[PDB]
Design a protein around this nucleic acid. Structure first.
Lengths: 134, 384, 63
RNA sequence: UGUGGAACGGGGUAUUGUAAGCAGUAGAGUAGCCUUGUUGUUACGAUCUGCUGAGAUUAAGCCUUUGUUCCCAAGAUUUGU
RNA sequence: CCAAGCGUUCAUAGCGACGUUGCUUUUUGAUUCUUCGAUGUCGGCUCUUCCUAUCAUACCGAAGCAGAAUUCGGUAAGCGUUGGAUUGUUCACCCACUAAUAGGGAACGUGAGCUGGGUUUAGACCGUCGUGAGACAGGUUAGUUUUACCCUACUGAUGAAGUGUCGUCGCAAUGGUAAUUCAACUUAGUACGAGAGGAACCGUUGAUUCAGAUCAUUGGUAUUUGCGGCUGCCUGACAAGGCAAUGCCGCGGAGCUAUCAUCUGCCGGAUAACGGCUGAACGCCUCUAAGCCAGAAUCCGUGCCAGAAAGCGACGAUUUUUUGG
RNA sequence: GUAGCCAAAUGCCUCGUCAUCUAACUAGUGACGCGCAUGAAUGGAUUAACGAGAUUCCCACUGUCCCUAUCUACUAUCUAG
RNA sequence: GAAGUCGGCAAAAUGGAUCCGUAACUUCGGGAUAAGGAUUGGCUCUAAGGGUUGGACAACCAACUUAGAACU
RNA sequence: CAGAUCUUGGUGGAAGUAGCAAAUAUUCAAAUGAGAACUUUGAAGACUGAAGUGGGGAAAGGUUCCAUGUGAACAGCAGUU
RNA sequence: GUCGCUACUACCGAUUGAAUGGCUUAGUGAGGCCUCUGGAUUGGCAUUGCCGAG
RNA sequence: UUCGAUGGUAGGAUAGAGGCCUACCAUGGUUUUAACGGGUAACGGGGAAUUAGGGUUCGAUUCCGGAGAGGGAGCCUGAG
């Protein structure tokens, strides 16, 4: 919410309880998705996220200081393929996210691995720490 | 508790098979006496689907001035033949047809509509009417003057030229098309001069126009509530099945309500989809039907190997964006929009950059036979 | 309106055809169809599969 | 009895992936036979290479066809201001 | 309802004692009018509908710079009211998202719809009580969930004609109906405002939920047993095949299908609260008494679905030199 | 009521108090015990191995689910008996 | 990837053989196939492990294993 | 006698309805016959796969064994068997 | 000596313990070297392919 | 003691000896005279401090030898 504007609809691939990798040097090894920001009301429907989303996650493996607490995170890579507006279906080799604050500023300083273009446009702070895009 | 929206819409009831196949216009556009005389509907045949790439002209959009890929539906629209005129008087019980005037000569295609076995019949359908037309030519004028003096709605009888369409059906589709324009007298005169004459698709519709598509959807047969109404599947432990509704009603009322999902027919229903934009009105007498200003290859609008289960489109066609009701080769009705369009999307001109002509019978990778020849080189049967 | 080349079979890729896979080592692969993608995931060698243009170029098929 | 239909055939479009057979010493090597070879014959040999973008399938709910061969110019019921 | 009062100061901004007039009761209780030749009994799942005693969304009013926050206050049930740890549970408490996670009825809705976690008294253990057999304001474990092929209801599918016959094109009485919400940006650093701060009508780009379709692309599906590969056995060998209740594996057109894919989803009238105009009554004033406008996601319509199988219209040809007309 | 043991299959109050796991547990385990109403062959405590016994948690895995879809055979369907 | 459900019910996953490695606890007997890893086809060879038998030996006949290597 | 979930007997609607779906599978030609999907012969395709759908016995049955004829009843379809 | 009370030490320690450096486990793996190919160009042969460097 | 630990045979590599490496063959080799493992707040020695004799402590440091150029690994030139 209120990252850089509007993002096109993308195929959801990371529902709740999904464990994705952590793509920054904050000290966490994985992110366990607890909730997804912006999810509406629908019976029995599990909230899910795509690249550039603003999920809430916990650290299951990593520093004990970073463990046992909820923290905002941004999804940067997903295994599920999604279609761009130019009719291109693309997907990454893994599901990965980065720990951020409610404003979207990364807790870490460097991003390892590629970053989706949609996430880069939505969150400029992620784009600065990112290397290659798509 | 745990509220959720109801499954399905109560406006599309009953979910029965449509009583027709052609697809009728339930409401023609409101008549205006200032604009010139024109038609308000047309008939075509769904040839198939493809996709196109075009530059998106939309200020403020993320993909502004950037190429986007969109799916389109191709509908073959050869010119229709006007063979009759019908006048409707406005009675306090609705619109009532006063009289119908037909043309002197009617083709075999339209004459087949009035028969179940045309070949076995004696081909006596408008013989005496033609005799009256040729006897002294006063009854036709008298009826036309009656339509001019009375009546407020004028509709011409026009039939499709299915003969020049690869469909095996020889019987033509006949339809009443309301004539909008200035004054009933001009409407009747326009019909009279257009008797036994062809009306083209580009005279009725134009590029970038928003229209409506009316047709009967693809038949699906009987179907359970899970796929007919999108209900939740019951757990695996459910005895005696799990693809049903667990509670179909409650005590008092001791009856099953009309709002409860039940198994039954799930297809072959009359629908009209609104706001279909015309991306291209192509002619059947040019070799660049599928050629754009950014792709100068002389190719027509036909996938490699022809349209799947349809054939080759050699007549005029339309490139409505998105999907349309009904399967391939079904006759579809195109109607002028009843609403007024002023949004950016509706008013945006469309300039296609590329139209896919690869085979839809598989994972086609060659747009044209020449491109296939150049890539593949010489083959064993090709050289000898 | 650009046309790409398949990263496995070498066939011309028109828009709206096949899929795109970006690996963890920041490499981009374009697959013309699921067959090419599956064989790549199975580690099949394009220089070994007879129907790939890379095999034809290596073996000088067609002279 | 008609821009008629059907059954095949051809072409196109698609799927798979290079058919059987022949030839080659290419082949890790292994045994006999000879004037004794910087291509020594012969026998066995997973496999490989060339004919071969080959072969096979291709409507059964693909397209097309001026190709071939046949078939239909019938039977029964109902219906009148 | 009354008003002693609290509310630096004003009895009803708003709280507001003591009494008093009522409504509801899903709290058990009271009685025993129905049922003991038999109404399967909690919860959960699924699904539909109804009420407002309104959580959010729509439009209004009340005070104070504004901007928030409150009365949710006035109308309003059209449209929504979530994902989890736990409780068998009803309820209730936490983790989060969200505009919101409002309350109830429908035999405390829903077992020939499901499940059997609760009860489930047969087997068995424990605590207390009893000499004992055994008992429980108790705990624990294991324990068969039958039948629709009948009538009606509902969902779909055919269907005769005395009112000529067979077809084509039509009208539409009636019944149903559908869209919903949010974010960002331009308004705008603008109105406002000593200051920091800070809106709104509109418009644009997107998105959530719902609804109707479609298969161009992508994904899934494999009896295309279509192609190729593999194991055991068999047809003397190669080749070509068969069996192994679809032998297994990779790809796999066509079809189907995916909020895993794509497309589409309006404006007219009458109003509720409320605000005004000409204007009396009650010689003036005051929205009201007559009359006229404005005005809600409200109601009814346009549009959309079905088409009265006993509603209707226009048009076409009327057993052929045999016969019937 | 000694040695032991415990909100234990035995504790009404009770979802007892504290600690642990989880983002969140009235669950589970580990400690405490004025224990309504534990307790020593009506046996108390512990116990390796064993168990289609009961309970809690973790990994692998998966249509249990998000969210359903597709395929096969036999029915259901129609027909003769 | 258990978010379903009272409850991982059902299904999936593992599975043969050879070579490594195997914890707490224990009644010292086990746990244990603990857990956790690697290999497996075809073809051509190499080495070792046994029987009678003609004058240090020996041309047969009659045999099955194990281990290793190259190639594909 | 109108009742007694009365007694015995006969006969209804449901109704040409539920249903006649475990055990992989049958096909071609000829003969007989009024009549052939079920009889016989030949051919083909399959199964039981020696802990068998094979060959014998104990208990039990009692002529079911064999030949020649019949097709009224049974063989929930048919029948020349 | 007991409890009562205060600062401090060490052990065990559920939490299926965490984290820094080494020893290993299985896979992957840059770069140089050797080795098989490889052939922009040169290279003796208007003339031709041969040793080739490469 | 596998993927070389002990020795033999043969070969490869090195400038050269050599289990340095490879294939095969036997199960060997060290160890209470302390093998193996661990700590070293350990570069070693000439030497320095204390000074009856004997002993104790230190040596990063003017000299000699060894290793290193943040950490490993690989290589060209060059006698090195």
């Amino acid at each position: 919410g209120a990252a850089s504007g509007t993002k096109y609809r993308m195929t959801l691939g990371l529902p709740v309880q999904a464990i994705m990798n952590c793509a920054d040097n904050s000290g966490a090894k994985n992110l366990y998705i607890v909730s997804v920001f912006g999810t509406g009301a629908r019976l029995n429907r599990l909230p899910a996220a795509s690249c550039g989303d603003m999920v809430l996650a916990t650290v299951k493996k990593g520093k004990p200081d970073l463990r046992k607490k909820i923290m905002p995170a941004i999804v940067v890579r997903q295994r599920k393929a999604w279609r761009r507006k130019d009719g291109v279906y693309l997907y990454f080799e893994d599901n990965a996210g980065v720990i951020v604050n409610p404003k979207g500023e990364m807790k870490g300083s460097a991003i390892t691995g590629p970053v989706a273009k949609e996430c880069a446009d939505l969150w400029p702070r992620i784009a600065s720490n990112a290397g290659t895009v798509v | 508790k745990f509220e959720q929206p109801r499954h399905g819409s109560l406006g599309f009831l009953p979910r029965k098979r449509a009583s027709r196949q052609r697809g009728k216009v339930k409401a023609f556009p409101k008549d205006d006496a200032s604009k010139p005389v024109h038609l308000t509907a047309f008939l075509g045949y769904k040839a198939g689907m493809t996709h196109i790439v075009r530059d998106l002209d939309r200020p403020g959009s993320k993909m502004h001035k950037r190429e986007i890929l969109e799916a389109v539906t191709v509908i073959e629209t050869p010119p229709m033949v006007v063979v009759g005129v019908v006048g409707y008087v406005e009675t306090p019980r609705g619109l009532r047809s006063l009289t119908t005037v037909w043309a002197e000569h009617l083709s075999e295609e339209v004459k087949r509509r009035f028969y179940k076995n045309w070949f076995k019949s004696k081909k006596k359908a408008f013989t005496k009417y033609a005799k009256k037309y040729a006897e002294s030519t006063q009854s036709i004028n008298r009826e036309l003057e009656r339509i001019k003096k009375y009546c407020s709605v004028v509709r011409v009888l026009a039939h499709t030229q299915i003969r020049k369409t690869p469909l095996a059906q020889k019987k033509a589709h006949l339809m009443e098309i309301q004539v909008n324009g200035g004054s009933v007298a001009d409407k009747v005169e326009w019909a009279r001069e257009h008797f036994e004459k062809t009306v083209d698709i580009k005279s009725t519709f134009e590029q970038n126009e928003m229209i409506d598509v009316i047709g009967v959807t693809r038949g699906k047969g009987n179907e359970g509530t899970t796929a007919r109404w999108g209900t939740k599947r019951l757990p695996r432990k459910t005895h005696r099945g799990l693809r049903k509704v667990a509670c179909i009603g409650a005590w008092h009322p001791a009856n099953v309500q009309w709002t409860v999902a039940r198994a039954g027919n799930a297809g072959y229903m009359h629908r009209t989809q609104l706001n279909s934009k015309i991306y291209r009105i192509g002619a059947g007498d040019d070799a660049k039907n599928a050629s754009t200003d950014f792709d100068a290859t002389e190719k027509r609008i036909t996938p490699m190997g022809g349209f799947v289960r349809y054939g080759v489109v050699e007549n005029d066609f339309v490139m409505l964006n998105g999907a349309t009701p009904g399967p391939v080769k079904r006759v579809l009705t195109l109607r002028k929009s009843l609403l007024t369009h002023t949004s950016r999307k509706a008013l945006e001109p469309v300039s296609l950059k590329w139209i896919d002509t690869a085979s839809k019978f598989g994972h086609g990778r060659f747009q044209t036979p020449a491109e296939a020849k150049q890539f593949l080189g010489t083959l064993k049967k090709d050289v000898a | 309106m650009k046309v790409e080349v398949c990263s496995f079979s070498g066939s011309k890729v028109y828009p709206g055809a096949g899929r795109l896979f970006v690996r963890g080592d920041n490499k981009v692969f374009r697959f013309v169809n699921k067959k090419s993608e599956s064989l790549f995931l199975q580690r099949k060698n394009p220089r070994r599969l007879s129907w790939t243009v890379l095999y034809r170029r290596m073996h000088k098929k067609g002279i």
